[PDB]
Symmetry: D2
């Protein structure tokens, strides 16, 4: 499986989206799992999930790594509403266009917020819900906010550079020795290729601050079986929000990885894959 | 598999144990997993683990459900040292007598303390370490101590009655509707059959208070891959000790079950079994 | 100062209250501080606050220890709405009847919920806000709910007895040696004197469960300078809600007392008095 | 009161210190309060405490703002043992040289660690113990370590610059608008004036890593009445260590300030002063 060989585009039409181009990477043919990426500069479906797509497809799933609006090879957009909800509308437009009735969701950070809004807005269109450090869930009980990683992500958005990209990647990972020239170069390419995405994200953040993303009050509505994952060492989204979700969602469990940065799906790919596949199969 | 058909006895000789009778239930023939029970009145290997033994044996493990000294059908004892360490000596004596060189351990509460002391004292004799609400790890950062469940466990030790047994079982479970006459009767039988165990436990607790059980300071020595499990709704041992372990043990992960009392292995048996088996196979 | 000599009654008329009798104890003549009691059986203004009224009056405050509707010598009531809000309406009716334009509030548990609803509903009628283990603020991130103390409080409501009263008082206090025959007798008298209050509270709880009391989502509206106090060892309302308030209210501080049960105002009266008086004078 | 007019030097002789020059600022003549500063580059007694010295002296205390070895105008040193203990030896040498039998201590961060070691090593030489974000107390239950602020403090030590100094000061404060040219210039002067202190601190940190500073296991020995303070928004030392202390020290209380960085004594000087003075007078 490669980015090139899985790469697809589809036009969506859904509340506020008109003939809007969505890029995604797709493989496999069984039950659909849509994976949704974080909101850092250069983020995209393949970049965030290339260690997971293979094992999920081997397990029998149809995997769609979606580029959210205003990221990677999806169309540029300036959003005046909180991104979780707008992104969720885009997931529904994608599913409608592809004739997918129900999907399991996997969401990292901004993608976790997307997945939560999707589950809230379209409960008949979701299977299982998998959340990896979901963002926007209001204040932490322990962590000063904005968190260290979020500050760096905004710095990179405003002043993109390879050095600042490196710094950010150093804070994303517990084990900085895992940061290869290849990982850096790939993220830098997504940044260099679509500078407008960076400008638009900052404009959107002024229109709809992070507090507007907080869906905490509605967590009780979620009936999807939910699997919450967190890196113990996540410097981007606070560990105690893993507990907030576990207490507020009806059917949830929480798995926390030791020696693990924000990207549990990448830094602990093997264990992440086995747990999530098991959950999809047996929970 | 039944209690009767798996029931075995063996004499142990180890530091402070002389021709000391240990009861255990054993089945299967592959890699050894010794499961270690909690410290409440009536506790024993079969009682705590009868929902787990079958699936672990089906998975290919040799399962030994051990009765710790001063519980169930093991010999009565008054302990002047912290129970985790004394119990761990008993596990080593059992393994020595059965010619078992290395075992994976699963430990609930008092059994979790046992498993931690075993890993500390005999690091060459342990495989993987599985901890389910381990007790004795010092103060909670949030929970007033003694915890509600611990108070009830001491009340039952001092004044055993079927009513107080019922109360305790109600606090052990998140879903009290899961408390059958059969579960009650079985725990009550272990209490009625060996009243001396109750007296001796209380005497032991006066000699060696819970603070003596705290091995927090030595957690950094543990090299066993460790899987920590907790019920979100555990009223016996505090949820934040799951985090204490995750931060202090080198290679650990933490799984917390929603809508789950202290006994995650019983209340969430299916998920518990799948996760722990997966961990033993693949971690 | 005595209960008898401070005892007053006033009729209130406010949204849903018609010629409704409120009992209170009043002393002093400077700025008004209304203290609001917890929701346990037998609770009342004097009982909860008799260690605080003297020092506050010596400091120059007019102190009103209010009996909330359905407690002590206030009129019986069955409430179909969450008690915080209904109680707050009663505080406003009391202030209106006494020609008090603004008051500082001190609220324990149910009284803390009252004080929060008052601050939200009538922001021009409050000075400073003092909260001592306020109840009803939704789930804890650590504590299984209902908490141990809340279970006991409901047990006493349903089956009042002097023994169960004693048990409850034992769980309220960190230092059980502080429980005198006098304290017990006084609480028991309030229970014996108005059995109907007990029945009505249980009926009200069925109509308006604790989740209906959660005003977390509105905490951002509070502009009152706020002083949050908690007993470290509170078995009735969870310590982490002290942090929830500190993060969600604009101008707040949190003081936690070691070796202190739920009743910080009683168990640590001297320090409580000095801190709260200082806050009222200088914050 | 000014830095110049309060400035004093004294030679100390104590375990490992021989004719070692200590600088301090002193004023007042009643009970002695020694204030102990943090470990960031440029830190010193006056810099950390100039908003507190006046009010404490007005209150009747003799205030000594001590420069710890290897900071400000105290002698340079390379330490091969954990700094808390070495600093505490220096406090005892200072008290011995000045004929001070007992002192109250106030300690910020590294100074909090100093104060804890002093209380442990010389319990007959301490009055009350005041701790403001004490450092070195082992892992956080929530915060990835090293914390954001600690990373920046090390960066400034290795590559001192006015820009990096500014960055660090921005992370120290909740309200960055409080950072004046005067505060910056004063900290920069302490850095520019003694570059060797910077080199030596980094060498010392290699010899004695932060884990060597953890005295958690001995907290039970402290009999001093203890007042623990924390900024809610402290990005240097984790808020949950405030709870660790409150649970582990016999007679403690915890006060947390909203909208407050690491330096509670500076950012919330007025409230800090009133609380600590009250504690010294009345606790
Ligand atoms: O790959 C990434 O860009 C990634 O993991 C981003 C994480 C942070 C993120 O999207 C976020 C956005 C809003 C609030 C919190 C967090
Ligand atoms: O089955 C049981 O008896 C059980 O799960 C007991 C749990 C509590 C327990 O053994 C314990 C002992 C010491 C400290 C904390 C907890
Ligand atoms: O004196 C008392 O009755 C007292 O302190 C009661 C505390 C518990 C309480 O009123 C409460 C009510 C609802 C939710 C949480 C707590
Ligand atoms: O003024 C300062 O330099 C200050 O507040 C420093 C705080 C951090 C600090 O000294 C520290 C040292 C070791 C571990 C944690 C924290
Ligand atoms: Na490498
Ligand atoms: Na049934
Ligand atoms: Na007495
Ligand atoms: Na200014």
């Amino acid at each position: 499986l490669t980015e090139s060989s899985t790469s697809k585009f589809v036009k969506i039409n859904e509340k506020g989206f008109s003939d809007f181009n969505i890029h995604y990477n797709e493989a496999g043919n069984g039950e659909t799992v849509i994976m949704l990426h974080g909101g850092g500069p250069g983020a995209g479906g393949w970049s965030n999930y290339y260690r997971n797509v293979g094992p999920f497809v081997d397990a029998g799933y149809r995997v769609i790594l979606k580029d959210s609006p205003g990221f990677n090879k999806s169309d540029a957009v300036v959003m005046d509403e909180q991104r979780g909800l707008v992104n969720a509308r885009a997931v529904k437009g994608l599913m409608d266009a592809l004739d997918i009735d129900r999907a399991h969701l996997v969401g990292n950070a901004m993608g976790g917020a997307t997945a939560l809004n999707f589950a809230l807005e379209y409960p008949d269109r979701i299977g299982k819900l998998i959340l990896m450090g979901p963002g926007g869930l209001g204040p932490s009980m322990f962590a000063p906010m904005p968190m260290e990683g979020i500050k760096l992500l905004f710095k990179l958005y405003a002043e993109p550079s390879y050095e600042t990209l490196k710094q950010m990647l150093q804070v994303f990972l517990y084990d900085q020795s895992l940061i290869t020239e290849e990982l850096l170069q790939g993220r830098w390419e997504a940044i260099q290729r679509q500078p407008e995405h960076l400008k638009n994200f900052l404009i959107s953040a002024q229109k709809a601050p992070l507090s507007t993303w907080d869906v905490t009050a509605r967590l009780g509505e979620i009936k999807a079986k939910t699997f919450i994952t967190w890196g113990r060492d996540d410097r981007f989204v606070p560990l105690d929000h893993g507990l907030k979700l576990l207490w507020n969602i009806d059917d949830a469990r929480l798995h926390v990885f030791s020696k693990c940065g924000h990207w549990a799906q990448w830094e602990h790919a093997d264990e992440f894959n086995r747990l999530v596949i098991d959950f999809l199969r047996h929970a």
